Design a protein around this ligand. Structure first.
Ligand SMILES: CC(=O)N[C@@H]1[C@@H](O)[C@H](O)[C@@H](CO)O[C@H]1O
Ligand SMILES: CC(=O)N[C@@H]1[C@@H](O)[C@H](O)[C@@H](CO)O[C@H]1O
Ligand SMILES: CC(=O)N[C@@H]1[C@@H](O)[C@H](O)[C@@H](CO)O[C@H]1O
Ligand SMILES: CC(=O)N[C@@H]1[C@@H](O)[C@H](O)[C@@H](CO)O[C@H]1O
Ligand SMILES: CC(=O)N[C@@H]1[C@@H](O)[C@H](O)[C@@H](CO)O[C@H]1O
Ligand SMILES: *[C@@H]1O[C@H](CO)[C@@H](O)[C@H](O)[C@H]1NC(C)=O
Ligand SMILES: [Ca+2]
Ligand SMILES: [Ca+2]
Ligand SMILES: [Ca+2]
Lengths: 705, 743
């Protein structure tokens, strides 16, 4: 029959208690008998039926008297499924007296009852007193419930919103909350809204990328780099000790042509726009949260305190943060070194280096999870909410360092403080500092970013869910037991599933927002990943996991401080990326200052001769001040080689010292940082302050009273 | 009604059992009516109607004729038992218990009730009576209800309406039962003889209500924090003062063999000759005093101090709201639209006017300097700077009143929904106007003086014949300090003088307008009617002046370490100045309640945020510390210098640029220099390449080195300061432990 009510009875179930008989020592059987007797004496129904599939396992089912449900609903501030009170029974309109109450709310009430009972229930399950304890789903998602009376909410919800065939359809948040709970509803609403404006972000990013694409022909510096008469004649200095000869500059046409796309004014405009996009996202999210708070039953007060089975060292945690950053940096460096120590070839080398780094990061993720779990366990938090808050902070910090250490190293600490060939810098001793090509390391940063984002999202989602679905696709293209048994055969989501999904989404948000200057197409990947992830989460939650008790919440949780922190960090990170990682500022300075007779020779501002007039000159006879073993010995009759640094030429009164152009460029970079930082923060403050005159609709809705 | 019995200080009715609450004053028809008689009879009819509704609502009233002027009639008021209790219930007035509840007639026995008249203090009784008089209606026309005591005075129906003081401030009440709180307040709080005693905020709150007690508590806390800042700033200034023989650059300037031999280059076009650098020895010494590392340390400490001040003010505010058990009435909030009343164009117009206000500020400073300098032909330069600052300050004070009037006009043109909206709009507009008016000259000196003037060969003219002004080799920091100190001192002095005098002189005119030889005893109400009305705005101007003072203290503390000391002295005087003026020369304000100071708190937070950037900019650009450090660390060394080790020797000569007189291009005024014909080259304050050279007069590597150092300093200092402020704000729990325990 697979009925939802009591067998041959008119009564609705809200939990199943399952145990293993001690008869295959009697201590466990006696303890369970005492616990069950206490539970029965407290005033709850019970019934035990043997499972046909397994004789050892015997399941126990419960019920819910109407009087107890009403009394406990009136116990705390609960509105219609305005505190409830039996003295005001007829005040609320009723369609039916025996089934009107939402089954989700009934399940939550009985969950509270079980939590308060002691012999306990949670510890009994943990220690093996009960094998499991869970509520029941409405029906099988495969087909409509046999019981015609049942609404079959699971089937309708699955077909409408969980199956991929409804990928394009809108999110039915009302059924989601009325079935699962407020936590799932708010999570999915936030995800949908996030995708909603990621659409606009992706459109703007695509516009900027296309604008960069249509300007390949006019990208003068790349053309000069390619022209053999200009690029080929320039002979660059060696970049390493033993595994590099003098190399012509024009070997980088592909690199320069690809870099000119991601190093144009379009990226600057996109970063500036994202600066205000972040604050618009925040402010509209507060508007939407207020609207949901008004429309939903989210004005119910929270318990003063809560129970937990479990009732300085902060420095030790920070030392682990430093070690995590260091180990990430060496992981990336070693990967690139080993791959290099053997059109497409160099690009493929970078791709495989990034792939290896991403793999190492993926393995390190599990170790970071485990160490965070033990370290937070050692603290013995007094309550639960603080436990989730501590997990959020510590896990977010570990993931942040583990996933952004390599990106930050590439953006800032690669080629920034390498001395001239005469006196190279060995920071740690016998460990030379890496230096980028004349264009810069922005393209490498973009490659690392895209590889990490793709790999993470794709591998995670695919490997975790798509297996049965891909099997079904392959098949298409190329006895019965009651509900409790089937539900038991499922697996539970634990207690951190929503936490893990939020962690994924926050790492995704950090990737899309922090380093947006390097990769303007990141929001498009964000949009695709979220469009898939929403349905992936819905399908997995409604198919492969046991039903979870609903909970009450008004905000996403502890992640909003991380949102604001990420925004304030992203503005400065983008400013520094544009200033230092990109070479836009030096070329603008050259255009406006070093193409005029005092320094240049052209009759008007132009980009001509930027490559020739910017590269420095080095003399081999001054190979080192120490006059020790050298790589420049022999290797042809070359006399002068050029390097990517702003320094005076040989023979100058200030030999191999930073020249006027260096300081002009540094001043321009710092001025850009200051102006962009100040303007962006001023605009963000103004936009936030413009709430009353822009989004007054929901505030008026609240003021309806 | 009935006439005066004869007891002057009696605050009761003639019977002696009913406590007066308000005095209503109206002009009787006994006057020789002129103009329109219909207006007079309508006025009378409205008066009887209002009195009829007031008595119907349950207020006992009686009148009396003034002893001297038969044309004035005073109408008393009283709040009987049931109405008092009922309205206390309606407004949720909290009363002493002995978990917490307002006062309701259902729970009379649950409160510490000793006597009806004693259970409700006179301030609360007057507040209740004011609410009754405001809510009560008198007459209706055109299907619209018209009500409010304010409307009657606005239309001239009533001359005034006010509570009464306990007794004369300087004399004890003749009534033995009278507490005479005014006497104690005058002896202990006002009357500066108690210049040092900690003011009793509890009695102030009891007498004048929360609205005044909160302001005075804020002022006291401000004064204490100012004491801390003043001590630290004095320490920094003293450290700068005691280290003078080590200020090498000023010694070089004063040395006749270095500063004397440097023939500087004329600043103006032709009205000033060449000059030698040694004539600024005194200015160099003063700058050594006011431009040391102590100034930087104090700027950092003040960046910390503003945050500590704000956080501890939040803690004190929490403690005070709990202590004065104002939570219930704070929650009880109702808004009534203004009874006087019955598009971004106005906003943009106001913004334009603000821009012009700044423009006149700059022009006034520049013109004062111009005239003082033109009149030419302790130190004459110091005297000239002081004079220019004096005229600029005078014009600023003149413009202050005009700006107030225009702000009132602008806010009146708009129709604020209620009194609170009007107050907030006026606060914002007045603050912007005063900010611009007072700080325009200071910002000009700091940032736009001697900053974008080219080399002497090609001077920069803004639009023709308006040559940009330039500073001396030391800089304009001393000029900015002089302007700031003059403005601050003059503002404080004039405000205190006007505050002390104007009510007093107006009261004296009021008294002398009664030359009739009374020389007798008069009742409380008649003599209290002669006091000034203390117009509806209230403490708005006091808060405004204190906020402008806060702006002066914080924004420009990188140039004047002694500003907190001036502020401390001013506030130490202002406590008693305000107390005396409120207790001696004004009618009793109607008590009311407020959560905090009000709309000024956002202003203070914004000023605190802006102070960091303003101070960083001042130290980076207005001062010359950054060039000094750059020379010490990177140009006294053999790559560019000749000294073996880092030193500041030779900074003056190696930094000053060179210019050849004959290289003056342009055919206009071909005799700027050749008239004197003394030498062939001059020195000027700018970093440019010397004559000859591939880039003859273009900015050199030193210029860009210095600019990069300045920008890096700005970035580093601002980021560090803001992060530190965020960390302090996070660490502070925002509430005291004891208050958290009680709540
Ligand atoms: C440092 C260096 O190699 N500069 C040369 C410059 O001398 C030459 O004139 C130019 C081609 O015209 O190419 C570049
Ligand atoms: C083109 C160039 O830089 N040539 C120089 C040469 O003048 C100098 O003599 C030598 C060091 O001895 O280094 C090299
Ligand atoms: C106040 C002052 O410094 N005066 C000196 C003066 O005594 C000296 O004769 C002159 C030499 O140039 O330099 C100046
Ligand atoms: C004592 C003295 O005047 N020292 C130097 C002088 O030799 C030099 O000519 C001038 C600028 O060229 O700077 C100064
Ligand atoms: C002392 C000095 O350098 N005087 C110069 C002179 O050498 C030059 O011929 C002339 C032309 O501008 O300008 C002046
Ligand atoms: C670069 O320039 C050299 C010298 O002109 C040349 O022969 C080569 O074909 C050019 N292109 C590449 C990819 O090396
Ligand atoms: Ca997932
Ligand atoms: Ca004053
Ligand atoms: Ca005052």
């Amino acid at each position: 029959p697979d009925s939802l009510f009591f067998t041959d009875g008119q009564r609705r179930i809200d939990f199943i208690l399952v145990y293993e008989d001690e008869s295959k020592n009697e201590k466990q059987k006696r303890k369970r008998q005492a616990y069950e007797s206490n539970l029965i004496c407290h005033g709850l129904q019970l019934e035990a039926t043997r499972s046909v599939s397994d004789d050892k396992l015997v399941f126990v089912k419960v019920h819910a008297p109407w009087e107890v449900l009403c009394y406990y609903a009136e116990i705390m501030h609960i509105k219609l499924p305005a505190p409830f009170e039996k003295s005001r029974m007829n005040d609320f309109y009723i369609l039916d007296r025996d089934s009107f109450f939402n089954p989700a709310t009934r399940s939550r009430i009985v969950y509270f009852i079980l939590s308060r009972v002691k012999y306990g229930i949670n510890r009994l399950v943990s220690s093996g007193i009960y094998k499991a304890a869970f509520p029941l789903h409405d029906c099988r998602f495969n087909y409509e419930s046999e019981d015609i009376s049942c609404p079959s909410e699971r089937y309708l919800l699955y077909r409408e919103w969980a199956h991929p065939r409804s990928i394009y359809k809108k999110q039915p948040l009302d059924l989601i909350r009325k079935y699962y709970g407020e936590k799932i509803g708010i999570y999915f609403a936030w995800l949908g809204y996030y995708t909603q404006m990621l659409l606009l972000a992706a459109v703007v990013g695509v516009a900027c990328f296309l604008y960069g694409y249509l300007d390949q022909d006019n990208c003068t510096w790349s053309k000069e780099v390619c022209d053999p008469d200009i690029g080929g004649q320039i002979l660059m200095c060696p970049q390493c000790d033993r595994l590099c000869p003098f190399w012509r500059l024009n070997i980088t046409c592909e690199s320069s042509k690809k870099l000119c796309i991601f190093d144009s004014f379009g990226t600057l405009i996109f970063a500036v726009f994202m600066g205000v996009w972040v604050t618009l996202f925040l402010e509209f999210w507060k508007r939407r949260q207020a609207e949901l708070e008004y429309e939903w039953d989210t004005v119910e007060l929270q318990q003063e305190e809560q129970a937990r089975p479990e009732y300085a060292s902060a420095v030790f945690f920070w030392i682990l943060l430093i070690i995590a950053s260091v180990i990430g940096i060496i992981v990336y460096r070693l990967s690139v070194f080993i791959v290099f120590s053997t059109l497409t070839p160099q690009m493929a080398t970078s791709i495989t280096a990034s792939i290896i780094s991403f793999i190492i990061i993926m393995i390190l993720n599990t170790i970071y999870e485990k160490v965070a779990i033990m370290i937070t366990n050692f603290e013995l938090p007094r309550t639960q909410t603080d436990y989730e808050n501590s997990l959020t902070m510590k896990m977010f910090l570990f993931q942040f360092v583990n996933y952004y250490s390599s990106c930050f190293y590439i953006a800032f600490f690669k080629g920034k403080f390498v001395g001239y060939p005469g006196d190279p810098v060995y920071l740690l001793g016998k460990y030379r500092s890496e230096e980028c090509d004349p264009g810069g390391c922005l393209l490498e940063l973009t490659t690392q970013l895209t590889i990490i984002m793709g790999g993470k999202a794709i591998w995670n989602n695919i490997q975790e869910v798509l297996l049965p679905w891909v099997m079904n696709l392959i098949g298409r293209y190329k006895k019965i037991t009651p509900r409790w048994e089937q539900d038991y055969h499922l697996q539970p989501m634990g207690k951190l599933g929503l936490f893990y999904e939020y962690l994924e989404m926050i790492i995704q948000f950090g990737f899309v927002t922090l380093f947006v200057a390097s990769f303007p197409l990141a929001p498009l990947l964000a949009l695709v990943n979220n469009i898939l992830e929403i349905r992936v989460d819905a399908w997995k939650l409604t198919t492969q996991f046991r039903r979870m008790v609903p909970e009450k919440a008004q905000d996403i949780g502890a992640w909003q401080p991380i949102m604001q922190g990420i925004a304030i960090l992203a503005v400065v990170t983008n400013a520094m990326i544009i200033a230092f990682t990109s070479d836009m500022i030096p070329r603008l300075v050259y255009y406006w200052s070093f193409s005029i007779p005092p320094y240049g020779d052209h009759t008007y501002y132009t980009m001509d001769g930027y490559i020739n007039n910017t590269l420095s000159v080095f003399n081999i006879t001054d190979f080192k001040n120490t006059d020790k073993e050298n790589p420049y010995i022999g290797l042809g009759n070359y006399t002068l080689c050029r390097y990517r640094d702003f320094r005076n030429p040989p023979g100058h009164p200030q030999e191999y010292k930073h020249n006027i152009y260096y300081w002009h460029v540094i001043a321009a970079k710092l001025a850009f940082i200051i102006v962009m930082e100040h303007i962006i923060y001023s605009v963000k403050f103004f936009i936030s302050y413009a709430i009353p005159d822009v989004s007054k609709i929901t505030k008026s809705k609240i003021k309806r009273e």
